Amino acid sequence: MFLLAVYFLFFSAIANGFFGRYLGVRGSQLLGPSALFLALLCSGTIFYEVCIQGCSTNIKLFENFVYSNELNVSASFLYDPLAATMTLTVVWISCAVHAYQNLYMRGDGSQTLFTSYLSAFTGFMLILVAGQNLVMLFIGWEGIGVCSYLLIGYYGSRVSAVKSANKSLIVNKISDGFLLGSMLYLWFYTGSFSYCSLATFQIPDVVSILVLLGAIGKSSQLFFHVWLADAMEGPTPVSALIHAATLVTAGIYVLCKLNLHSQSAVGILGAATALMGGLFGLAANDLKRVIAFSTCSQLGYMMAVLSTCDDGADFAMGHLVSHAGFKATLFLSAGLSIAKENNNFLNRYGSRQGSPTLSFATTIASLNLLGFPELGGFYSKESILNNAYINQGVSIILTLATFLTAFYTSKVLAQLYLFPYGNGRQQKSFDIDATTLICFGLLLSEMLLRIFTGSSLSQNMTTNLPAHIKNLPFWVALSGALSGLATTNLFSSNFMRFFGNRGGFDVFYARKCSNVFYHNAYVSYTLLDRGFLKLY
Amino acid sequence: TTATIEERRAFHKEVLDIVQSKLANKNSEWARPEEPILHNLKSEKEEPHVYYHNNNFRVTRQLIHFEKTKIFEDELDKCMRTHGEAKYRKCQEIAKRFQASCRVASNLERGPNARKRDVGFIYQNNKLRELEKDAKELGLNNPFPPSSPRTTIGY
Amino acid sequence: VDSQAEWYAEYDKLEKARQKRRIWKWRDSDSRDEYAINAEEPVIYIR
Amino acid sequence: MSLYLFMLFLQPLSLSFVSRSFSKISSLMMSFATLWSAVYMWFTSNGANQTFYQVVSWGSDWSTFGVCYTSLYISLLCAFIFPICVILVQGYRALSILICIQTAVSLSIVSLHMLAFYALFESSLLLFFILIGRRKYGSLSAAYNISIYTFISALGFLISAFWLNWSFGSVCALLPNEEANSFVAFGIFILLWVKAPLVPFHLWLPEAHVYAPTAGSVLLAGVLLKISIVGLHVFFLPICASSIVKAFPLILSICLGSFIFSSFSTLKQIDLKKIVAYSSISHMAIVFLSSATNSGLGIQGAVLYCIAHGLISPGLFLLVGILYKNTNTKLVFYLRGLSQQAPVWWSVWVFFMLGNLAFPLFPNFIAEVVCLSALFKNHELYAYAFIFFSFVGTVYSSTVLGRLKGGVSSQCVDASRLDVISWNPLVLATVVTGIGYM
Amino acid sequence: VKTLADYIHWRNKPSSIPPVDEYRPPVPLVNYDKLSTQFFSKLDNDPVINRVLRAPKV
Amino acid sequence: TLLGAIFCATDALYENYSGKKSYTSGMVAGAATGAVFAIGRPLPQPLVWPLV
Amino acid sequence: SSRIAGDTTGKYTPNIFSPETPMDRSFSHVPKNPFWEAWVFRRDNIQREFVWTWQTIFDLATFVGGLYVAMYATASFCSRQNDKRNGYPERNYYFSDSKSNFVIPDEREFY
């Protein structure tokens, strides 16, 4: 029963991408959503069996996947509470994205290949989450990396999309290299790759740094966030999957599965990434970019909370699962707005008659991001902010990030709906089928269920804080939202420009790192092999 | 310890006799020896028959060690999965045994340049214990952490 | 197929060849003038 | 073993008696028969014989042939990859040269005598000079490079073999001998240094590959580079272990430098064949270092990675040859829109390039993991150095794929039925090894 | 004293001189392209900018 | 004669000062001879001759 | 102006005398460019423009020699650490001047 979900996704991938000539566009519009629905039924069974009823299961497919001398690893799947929760969230979001793609990608030539890549992408994410050993996780990590390369660069005749895919691939190579080094350290000194025997009470700092460096790649933290903003070249369904669940979450999942992180580093890196991402999102004028910077900020919050307390891992995973739903909703709604208006710029959006479902889903997702009380996003974010009070540095930065988050989120909501119409007087239209309505029904259902069921066991446990300190996140969010509605100026033009250039990390890489890389290549080749050592 | 040429030629003749006795009856497990040929040679390469037989014995032993390690890992994984949250206290022994097996397998034939595999951080913990004892007795201040009770699930 | 017999036979053949080679490599000077090194050899000179 | 050697001797023999019109058919059938004989040799190789599975001698130390773990894998790889080379080549002259080269190479792998090894491997010296220097599509410079580099390295190896034959009295691997001499170790090492391209002795390889026919390039990358690992495992580590341990800091410096400089040089390449050639040079460094550690993990890892390369590099060279036949260009700048214009060629190209980058479902991943584990067994820094610099391979491969993937093109340049037939065995073998049947 | 050094073809001068005229790829035109090297400048708070952007009632 | 005198003198002087027979003595004698050979020669030669 | 050269039935003949151009493998060749061809030639034959200048010597020594020196120093450090870790006596390496003959550890001996 547990294997079935992975089978359904890989089957949908093979069918759509190898037998699409027979199935057709309509055949992929059937087999994709059907397989994802079946996988949702299996994931729901897994979630009930493991999470609610505390029944972890291990399925060993085969032994001796790698058998060289002492080194021995097997392909085995352990469904633990973290795996069940992530499997459920991933499959729910993927099923929604598959339903969404039926209408969105009708205007794209390869809808069969797109559906195939989406299902293979979901399968590799489930392999990463459910792996019982570090090698299976690496298999999933690389599979999602390759699927992202094949999906971001889907538009090959655009130089920006191919460059965005190359950027993703290179950054992910650097990260998985650090991970491979850490896995080698852990195998050598613990004797196994299985997480049960992997447990080490005291680990040398080197392994901790290598683990963190590996994780900061997929979960785009500071210095490694360049690829996320660029990943906007790909079609909207890809962005929803990568940002909401498949890619950003993997780093957090790795850090939570093996608690080798160092408190000092994770807190500072997280709080910095939260603030920087919020500031970058303030300057952004593309709808899809703002939601990416919001993803960066939220990832910063999840990374930061690990430092605060022992329950930080539970709080981080709880935020991760709460975030995937609303963030997916934000991307799908942004895509539909872009499709309906033929515009990507916030300036040209405005009030216009539309579907009630889409406008409500956008409002509720934005409210969850903002932190509106009595919402799934609110509980998962307050759990972090309240517990971070002990670390004075992390708390102050995270509150400032909450303010900036509220400001941009409110500005975006005002610009997309409240603001008067800003596009031209030309005939534009995108009619929504019942499949899109089902997709939004699924996202809203996830959002509602999250409030009733919660995200962590310790979510509502009392944090012994004065009332003024416990309710401050709300006041900061409200103040930011009010300032964002008024569309006031917060920073001087020098800083607004700085934030628009994203801190100039990419300008540094191009002017110095890329030039050094190609000078090393020039010395290695032109000066030496084909110069000094080449005959006349 | 010195080996005279008379003793060396005597051992060579004995080795030839051992080969002749082995040759008399066919054995399908000739290259999977259960016992080594005992010797006091400076270099094993001197007696080719001893060298090859002992190498085959060492390969047999290493294969057995690798399979034993896999068995130990299977019992540790089962034990860990049965106990639940009591795994740390109840699976200390099984883990200790598994880690010992891993060290034996890796260390026996590591190679000329390979370092000893410190499964369980036993060597590091020992070194820290010695460093602490010396610093405390000599009145020095140790710049290293003190030895730990447990550094891994077992060792 | 008695592998042990084949291995021992091959090793023996190689060892015999090595011994024969070393015996062959023991070569004194064959110069006609060099009577001292080859005193015991039975040669007749027609000169 | 005897069946394999007999089939090997029959394949060059068959050409003398064929009709001159049936040459290609006969050569293909002979290649398949040699593959089947290799499978029979594998069947008749019992794991119970731990040291050497089978040894045969035909009256002298030179005619001593035998199969071990390294020899068995390399011989099976050569027999697997030869049919592809055969079908890709047309003409009696070309067939004769290729069949003679293959016979010499396949006899070298199973040889257990250093002098016989030299006699068989270096017999195919003029044939490569003539093949790489063919009238219209060949370069005399590349032929001279490969020939001179081979002659100098093999002559040094020959001098070391002569000293070992004089001092010990025999040069057969089956007789246990140890030497601490550094001159003799260097003599044996220099051959390995040149044959498996290691900086700064790698210049001969790219020239030869670019100006060789596709059958020649496929054979060269697939198995000719591997002949170094057979010499290391069979003729160097048993006798000159002390010198490899004495020089390990230098060996590591030269291997890592080769990996780095080759990776950086691959970045400045505009020709697809040169890109594949420099990728091979970079990949050879890990195999060489892993074997030099003289550990179980290293020898197995090196052989496994060699098989993975011997399955991934022929695929890329085959696809490059197919593309060149379709377009008469190897410049990445002229080739654009290949995704839209050749969806079937593109799929296989992307798959093989993913294999070259050591992704998990490919044999390269497992092999790399084992080799990195062996390096980590030696020192953690040794492993880290290799793992970090692997990104350079990603940068060049990504740039190439991106340039080829999109653009505007007015030519439909896709593979024919013959081209798919030629890569299907390589694809299936790659998949099977990737899933763990190494 | 005549020596090999006199007759060896030392690589001191380039045998081939690249063509002076070189291709510059076509690029979309940016009307005003002067780089801003000063984070703090009077231009940001210029009277013109205040009248054009900051002051108009919105 | 001048070049050979330089080489022999430097070799003997280094060996006496160092007190040991070593490769370095030959290297420094060769380097000094090659430096004297390349006193007025163009750019590459000052590097190449001390090495050869 | 064009005709299908290939025949699936096997009755393929090359009409060398056909007025109409055969759609053979040569139909899909990409048109070359005079300037691209000269760029390719210049890139391959870049040894002609090589000149020994102080900047070239500096760059070569600093990156190639510098990397080689760093790599040797790191390998020597790692060897020293491993020898200390293993408990082996200082090994006689090639360039190391050690008054010890230790090279290969004895398998029988316990270190």
Ligand SMILES: CCCCCCCCCCCCCCCCCC(=O)OC[C@H](COP(=O)([O-])OCC(O)COP(=O)([O-])OC[C@@H](COC(=O)CCCCCCCCCCCCCCCCC)OC(=O)CCCCCCCCCCCCCCCCC)OC(=O)CCCCCCCCCCCCCCCCC
């Ligand atoms: C008992 C019952 C009967 C059952 C049968 C059993 C009998 C057993 C053996 C009997 C088989 C007949 C032997 C064939 C004799 C003639 C072969 C020949 O002429 O070759 C080309 C000839 C093709 O003739 P063609 O196309 O009509 O045009 C040639 C024209 O005459 C001139 O054309 P071109 O001017 O345009 O020249 C172009 C040339 C391009 O120019 C070159 O490349 C020149 C390169 C110089 C030689 C190549 C160096 C490397 C060769 C390596 C050896 C190959 C085997 C590798 C195995 C390693 C062995 C250590 O390209 C070629 O010629 C072919 C390239 C590759 C062939 C080279 C191999 C031949 C080596 C020596 C041939 C024997 C001649 C002895 C003369 C006897 C009285 C005069 O034959 C072939 O089909 C290919 C060669 C077959 C090689 C088997 C011969 C054994 C040699 C291996 C040495 C092992 C020791 C011998 C023991 C053998 C078993 C006891």
Ligand SMILES: CCCCCCCCCCCCCCCCCC(=O)O[C@@H](COC(=O)CCCCCCCCCCCCCCC)COP(=O)(O)OCC[N+](C)(C)C
């Ligand atoms: C042009 C192509 C068009 C056609 C496409 C073909 C579609 C191929 C389908 C993909 C295959 C996916 C199956 C992956 C498992 C590989 C099957 C396998 O290897 O068989 C195993 C048996 O194991 C299985 O059957 C696995 C069950 C397969 C299906 C179960 C769930 C399916 C979901 C896919 C997830 C698999 C994740 C595994 C990641 C490593 C052999 O058993 P052993 O005797 O132990 O072999 C020794 C092991 N070793 C290979 C290492 C030597």
Ligand SMILES: CCCCCCCCCCCCCCCCCC(=O)O[C@@H](COC(=O)CCCCCCCCCCCCCCC)COP(=O)(O)OCC[N+](C)(C)C
């Ligand atoms: C792990 C257990 C089960 C494994 C199943 C894996 C999922 C399916 C794997 C199928 C084969 C793996 C690799 C297929 C060949 C690689 C080429 C490829 O994937 O796509 C080809 C073409 O795709 C195909 O024809 C075959 C794809 C069928 C299924 C692919 C699913 C996604 C691949 C999985 C990634 C492989 C994992 C390797 C590393 C873990 C090229 O696509 P584009 O470069 O994007 O250009 C297409 C044109 N356009 C511009 C419009 C986008």
Ligand SMILES: CCCCCCCCCCCCCCCCCCCC(=O)O[C@H](COC(=O)CCCCCCCCCCCCCC)COP(=O)(O)OCCN
């Ligand atoms: C919250 C955690 C921190 C996140 C990021 C913090 C980054 C802080 C580092 C910048 C602050 C110190 C900068 C050094 C002082 C330089 C002051 C003026 C700079 C200058 O004059 O030259 C520049 C040198 O580039 C440079 O200044 C490059 C130096 C940067 C050091 C490497 C650190 C990584 C930087 C990554 C992001 C930083 C983006 C902007 C630096 C531009 O040189 P030019 O091109 O005009 O020269 C002409 C080409 N011939």
Ligand SMILES: CCCCCCCCCCCCCCCCCCCC(=O)O[C@H](COC(=O)CCCCCCCCCCCCCC)COP(=O)(O)OCCN
């Ligand atoms: C006690 C002795 C003291 C030391 C004294 C040393 C004195 C000289 C020693 C040098 C020996 C090396 C032999 C190789 C010479 C270089 C190649 C000749 C250059 C050449 O022009 O060859 C052309 C093509 O060669 C090529 O294309 C080949 C390119 C270069 C080959 C690289 C050499 C192999 C690797 C070198 C060392 C490797 C390991 C060393 C242990 C063919 O010219 P042509 O046919 O047109 O004739 C027309 C006349 N110009």
Ligand SMILES: CCCCCCCCCCCCCCCCCCCC(=O)O[C@H](COC(=O)CCCCCCCCCCCCCC)COP(=O)(O)OCCN
């Ligand atoms: C400068 C970096 C070195 C470049 C090599 C890098 C990596 C190569 C390592 C290869 C591995 C095995 C080879 C064994 C030794 C070769 C080089 C080792 C380094 C070396 O030169 O040590 C020398 C001794 O080696 C010797 O005496 C023999 C040197 C090699 C001879 C050169 C050509 C020989 C060709 C002979 C052909 C066949 C002859 C067979 C009779 C002097 O070191 P030292 O111990 O005196 O320390 C005194 C310092 N204070």
Ligand SMILES: CCCCCCCCCCCCCCCCCCCC(=O)O[C@H](COC(=O)CCCCCCCCCCCCCC)COP(=O)(O)OCCN
């Ligand atoms: C074919 C060998 C020719 C050398 C090729 C090197 C590249 C040529 C460039 C010209 C440079 C002049 C030659 C220098 C090479 C010597 C290596 C320097 C190492 C060194 O200085 O240590 C010395 C010992 O090394 C030694 O003197 C013995 C090392 C043996 C040299 C390296 C052997 C393998 C090199 C072959 C690599 C590839 C072959 C292709 C050429 C000092 O020792 P010390 O006893 O004085 O201690 C000091 C107590 N006062």
Ligand SMILES: CCCCCCCCCCCCCCCCCCCC(=O)O[C@H](COC(=O)CCCCCCCCCCCCCC)COP(=O)(O)OCCN
């Ligand atoms: C003409 C040709 C050459 C001219 C130009 C050459 C200029 C290069 C000079 C510096 C190059 C890098 C510095 C390395 C050597 C520094 C001094 C060597 C002496 C030495 O071994 O000291 C060790 C250096 O630290 C170390 O162990 C190595 C630290 C540096 C390695 C990492 C730096 C870059 C990393 C990039 C990757 C490269 C390595 C990849 C594995 C530490 O002393 P000790 O404790 O060992 O005592 C050992 C007794 N002296």
